[PDB]
Amino acid sequence: KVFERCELARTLKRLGMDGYRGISLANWMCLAKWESQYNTRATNYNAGDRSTDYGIFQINSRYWCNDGKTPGAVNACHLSCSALLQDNIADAVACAKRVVRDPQGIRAWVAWRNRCQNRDVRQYVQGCGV
Fold this sequence. Notes:
The longest helix has 12 residues, at 25-36. This protein has helices at 5-14, 25-36, 90-99, 110-115, and strands at residues 43-46, 51-54, 59-60. It has a single domain (1-130), classed as Lysozyme (Orthogonal Bundle), CATH 1.10.530.10. By secondary structure, the protein is an alpha+beta fold. β2 and β3 form a beta hairpin. It contains four helices and three strands. It is an enzyme of class 3 (hydrolase). Residues 1-130 form the C-type lysozyme domain.
């Protein structure tokens, strides 16, 4: 599913993402936007290390979900990477919360650092009623 901006903002808000571990809804929107252009079936294979990024948040198979084909990988979200390719984002949100429960927080995603950190992200939630 390809989410429309404001539709996604309210979806994330209803799932408990606004301020989760101090991360505003605008930051999560900026992350999904730059990671997948709001696309739940987005995927990116990393030929360099045999891992794959899955879904709207592009969560990596090496540590967060199991796809059965990444060497010595773990599954901290206790999910099949397939769960991260559903139109319903509940499972992807539960995993994203798990990622940020670690030391780096939202910084776990390099793209957040490159295009969201120290930027004006207000535009992502403006007019969404969140």
